Curated annotation (Swiss-Prot):
Gene: BRD1
Start and end residues of each Bromo domain: 9-113
Name of the protein in question: Bromodomain-containing protein 1
Stretch of the intact protein here: 555 to 674 of 1058
Domain of life: Eukaryota
Glycyl lysine isopeptide (Lys-Gly) (interchain with G-Cter in SUMO2) crosslink residues: 41
Localization (cell): Nucleus; Chromosome
Function: Scaffold subunit of various histone acetyltransferase (HAT) complexes, such as the MOZ/MORF and HBO1 complexes, that acts as a regulator of hematopoiesis. Plays a key role in HBO1 complex by directing KAT7/HBO1 specificity towards histone H3 'Lys-14' acetylation (H3K14ac), thereby promoting erythroid differentiation.
Tissues where this protein is expressed: Highly expressed in testis.
Subunit (UniProt): Component of some HBO1 complex composed of KAT7/HBO1, MEAF6, ING4 and BRD1/BRPF2. Component of the MOZ/MORF complex composed at least of ING5, KAT6A, KAT6B, MEAF6 and one of BRPF1, BRD1/BRPF2 and BRPF3. Interacts (via PHD-type zinc finger domain) with unmodified histone H3. Interacts (via PWWP domain) with dimethylated and trimethylated 'Lys-79' on histone H3.
Length: 121
Protein backbone atom coordinates (compact mmCIF):
# COMPACT_ATOMS: atom_id res chain seq x y z
CA UNK A 1 0.00 0.00 0.00
CA UNK A 2 0.85 3.61 -0.31
CA UNK A 3 0.32 4.04 3.51
CA UNK A 4 2.94 1.26 4.20
CA UNK A 5 5.40 3.10 1.98
CA UNK A 6 4.77 6.46 3.70
CA UNK A 7 5.33 4.73 7.07
CA UNK A 8 8.54 3.21 5.77
CA UNK A 9 9.75 6.64 4.57
CA UNK A 10 9.05 8.04 8.15
CA UNK A 11 11.11 5.12 9.62
CA UNK A 12 13.89 5.76 7.14
CA UNK A 13 14.03 9.38 8.05
CA UNK A 14 13.96 8.55 11.82
CA UNK A 15 16.87 6.18 11.14
CA UNK A 16 18.70 9.07 9.40
CA UNK A 17 18.18 11.32 12.38
CA UNK A 18 19.16 8.59 14.92
CA UNK A 19 22.30 7.85 12.93
CA UNK A 20 23.37 11.49 13.33
CA UNK A 21 22.36 11.33 17.09
CA UNK A 22 24.45 8.13 17.48
CA UNK A 23 27.45 9.78 15.88
CA UNK A 24 27.18 12.76 18.09
CA UNK A 25 26.89 10.62 21.29
CA UNK A 26 29.77 8.41 20.30
CA UNK A 27 31.97 11.49 19.88
CA UNK A 28 31.44 12.10 23.57
CA UNK A 29 33.32 8.80 24.18
CA UNK A 30 36.69 9.62 22.77
CA UNK A 31 38.37 6.88 24.77
CA UNK A 32 36.14 4.27 22.96
CA UNK A 33 35.19 2.75 26.30
CA UNK A 34 31.64 2.07 25.03
CA UNK A 35 32.45 1.20 21.44
CA UNK A 36 32.17 -2.56 21.61
CA UNK A 37 30.55 -5.27 23.83
CA UNK A 38 32.24 -6.07 27.06
CA UNK A 39 34.31 -9.19 26.18
CA UNK A 40 33.07 -12.35 27.94
CA UNK A 41 36.47 -13.88 27.29
CA UNK A 42 38.05 -11.03 29.34
CA UNK A 43 35.17 -10.53 31.85
CA UNK A 44 33.81 -14.07 32.18
CA UNK A 45 31.40 -13.28 35.06
CA UNK A 46 29.88 -10.25 33.26
CA UNK A 47 26.40 -11.69 32.61
CA UNK A 48 26.14 -12.68 36.28
CA UNK A 49 26.19 -8.88 37.00
CA UNK A 50 24.63 -7.27 33.88
CA UNK A 51 21.51 -8.82 32.38
CA UNK A 52 21.17 -6.67 29.30
CA UNK A 53 24.63 -5.69 27.95
CA UNK A 54 24.77 -2.83 25.44
CA UNK A 55 27.39 -0.89 23.46
CA UNK A 56 27.58 1.45 20.54
CA UNK A 57 28.40 -1.24 17.91
CA UNK A 58 25.33 -3.26 18.96
CA UNK A 59 23.18 -0.11 18.71
CA UNK A 60 24.52 0.62 15.27
CA UNK A 61 23.59 -2.90 14.08
CA UNK A 62 20.04 -2.37 15.33
CA UNK A 63 19.86 1.10 13.84
CA UNK A 64 20.95 -0.09 10.38
CA UNK A 65 18.34 -2.81 10.37
CA UNK A 66 15.85 0.06 11.10
CA UNK A 67 15.17 -1.59 14.42
CA UNK A 68 14.43 1.59 16.43
CA UNK A 69 10.71 2.47 15.96
CA UNK A 70 10.93 5.67 17.98
CA UNK A 71 13.45 7.78 19.94
CA UNK A 72 12.37 6.18 23.30
CA UNK A 73 13.66 2.76 22.12
CA UNK A 74 17.02 4.32 21.10
CA UNK A 75 17.33 6.17 24.40
CA UNK A 76 16.60 2.96 26.30
CA UNK A 77 19.69 1.33 24.69
CA UNK A 78 21.87 4.43 25.35
CA UNK A 79 20.83 4.49 28.97
CA UNK A 80 21.77 0.75 29.22
CA UNK A 81 25.32 1.56 28.14
CA UNK A 82 25.64 4.14 30.93
CA UNK A 83 23.69 2.36 33.62
CA UNK A 84 25.44 -1.06 33.08
CA UNK A 85 28.82 0.65 33.46
CA UNK A 86 27.89 2.58 36.57
CA UNK A 87 26.78 -0.64 38.28
CA UNK A 88 29.68 -2.94 37.24
CA UNK A 89 32.42 -0.42 37.85
CA UNK A 90 33.12 1.54 41.08
CA UNK A 91 32.93 5.28 41.33
CA UNK A 92 36.72 5.65 41.45
CA UNK A 93 37.33 4.08 38.05
CA UNK A 94 38.02 5.53 34.61
CA UNK A 95 35.08 3.44 33.31
CA UNK A 96 32.50 4.88 35.74
CA UNK A 97 33.80 8.38 35.20
CA UNK A 98 33.61 7.98 31.41
CA UNK A 99 29.95 6.97 31.77
CA UNK A 100 29.12 10.02 33.88
CA UNK A 101 30.71 12.32 31.31
CA UNK A 102 28.87 10.53 28.45
CA UNK A 103 25.56 10.83 30.26
CA UNK A 104 26.09 14.56 30.96
CA UNK A 105 27.26 15.43 27.48
CA UNK A 106 24.72 13.18 25.74
CA UNK A 107 21.83 14.88 27.57
CA UNK A 108 22.25 18.02 25.49
CA UNK A 109 22.18 16.05 22.21
CA UNK A 110 19.17 14.01 23.25
CA UNK A 111 17.20 17.06 24.39
CA UNK A 112 17.35 18.59 20.90
CA UNK A 113 16.77 15.23 19.20
CA UNK A 114 13.48 14.92 21.01
CA UNK A 115 12.42 18.38 19.84
CA UNK A 116 13.37 17.42 16.19
CA UNK A 117 11.55 14.12 16.33
CA UNK A 118 8.36 15.88 17.61
CA UNK A 119 8.86 18.89 15.28
CA UNK A 120 9.36 16.87 12.00
CA UNK A 121 6.85 14.27 13.36
Amino acid sequence: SMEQVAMELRLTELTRLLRSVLDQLQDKDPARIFAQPVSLKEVPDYLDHIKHPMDFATMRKRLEAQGYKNLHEFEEDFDLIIDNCMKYNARDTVFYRAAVRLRDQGGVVLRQARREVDSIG
